[PDB]
Design a protein around this ligand. Structure first.
Ligand SMILES: Nc1ncnc2[nH]cnc12
Ligand SMILES: Nc1ncnc2[nH]cnc12
Ligand SMILES: [Mg+2]
Ligand SMILES: [Mg+2]
Lengths: 236, 236
């Protein structure tokens, strides 16, 4: 079951088989071995490449929503890591999977989000969109992405669902980074207007240790190799 | 069943329930209503938002690979639309789902593709990657994306799989644009080196008509609206 770690922010109890499997499967990488400048970049591939882990996530969330009342009407996944988990859940629940993407990636008449201004050195906010009418009045939307870090896109999701005259069921993530206080900030911003938004995570990055480090030890070459270079390494 | 429309390029017979469902569900948009400058941009959302269609695709491809011999060992999906279909198939087949993304989106030691030089006015080629070792020697990889248009990323997929000392089972797409001759070009380029690569599609864009047009008729406003603008349209 989900335990309330802070107001309206829940974490799957670590005794659960899914929590255990995630802790076992996850691999994180330091800057020199990752695409982002964060201490530990939790690779979604370590999850999607693990058949047992992917199935465990699918089974758990599907059961969750089938048991939920009133049931969700839509799953809204974030480009692109949310696309990895949303469709496999939506296909079972037999509900639409909507895509939240930047305007230059989405088709049709779109609705764009209104991110807050950045905070000195703090990365630039992304304007995200959904096609106008993809979610209608009365819709109960489940928001999904792999990692809840700063929560910028999570906020875009909330804005888009509200503007659509719909309600957010909950913001779900495979992994949360509690240190970044995304849930805390979203729950207090603009006079606690999103105080009632529920956040659920399957694993906290605090559960990840050095055993989860995917960095190549004692490696001194480049991070990226060309196919030609790799081809030369074996008889072909 | 799949019919050979040209050498090593197969199209699902249009009598099939899946082909029919795709023709019914698909929605395309003209430039003023899309993010790309192509006559008819086939929106992947028209597929993912259709529960019955998404399930039909999942069921069909899963059955295909379970019946296949030797069976595929990996599913490699293209960022980001391939991420929408790959995981739901891989979870059933209980095999890894690998991600092909640009270097600045992927983690770990990566292998990058070597795209051909562009052709006057013809859009710039994308260097794509996969984590080194995500696919090993002996792996039989199924490549997936939603639309097979120019085939630039398809070629990146082939290069990455070959460099990994693995073999491509087939390049699968929900929709193909035969006019762009991606399969034909890939099958002849570099002295027919990829002649044996199989391409399969579930629907040809030739099946899409004006009835599939998602453009707002007699509309004169902007393509993108802000949440604030949409909020003003209803009581809140
Ligand atoms: N995968 C990830 N791990 C840690 N912080 C992140 N911020 C954004 N993506 C992240
Ligand atoms: N969705 C799409 N439809 C038509 N041509 C495309 N080229 C790239 N994506 C396309
Ligand atoms: Mg995001
Ligand atoms: Mg592509």
């Amino acid at each position: 079951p989900f335990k309330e770690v802070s107001p309206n922010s829940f974490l799957l109890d670590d005794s659960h088989a899914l929590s255990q499997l995630l802790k076992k499967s996850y691999r994180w990488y330091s800057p020199v071995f990752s695409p982002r400048n964060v201490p530990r970049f939790a690779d979604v591939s370590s999850i999607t490449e693990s058949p047992e882990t992917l199935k465990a996530i699918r089974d758990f969330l599907v059961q969750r929503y089938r048991a939920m009342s009133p049931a969700p009407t839509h799953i809204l996944g974030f480009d692109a890591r949310g696309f990895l988990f949303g469709p496999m859940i939506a296909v079972e629940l037999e509900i639409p999977f909507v895509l939240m993407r930047k305007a230059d990636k989405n088709a049709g008449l779109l609705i764009r989000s209104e991110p807050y201004e950045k905070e000195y050195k703090e990365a630039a906010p992304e304007v995200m969109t959904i096609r106008y009418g993809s979610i209608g009045k009365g819709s109960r939307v489940v928001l999904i992405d792999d990692v809840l870090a700063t929560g910028g896109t999570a906020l875009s999701g909330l804005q888009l669902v509200e503007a659509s005259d719909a309600v957010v069921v909950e913001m779900v993530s495979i992994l949360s980074i509690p240190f970044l206080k995304a849930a805390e900030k979203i729950h207090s911003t603009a006079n606690s207007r999103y105080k009632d938004i529920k956040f659920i995570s399957l694993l906290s990055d605090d559960a990840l240790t050095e055993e989860n480090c995917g960095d190549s030890k004692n490696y001194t070459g480049p991070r990226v190799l060309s196919c030609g270079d790799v081809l030369a390494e074996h008889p072909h």
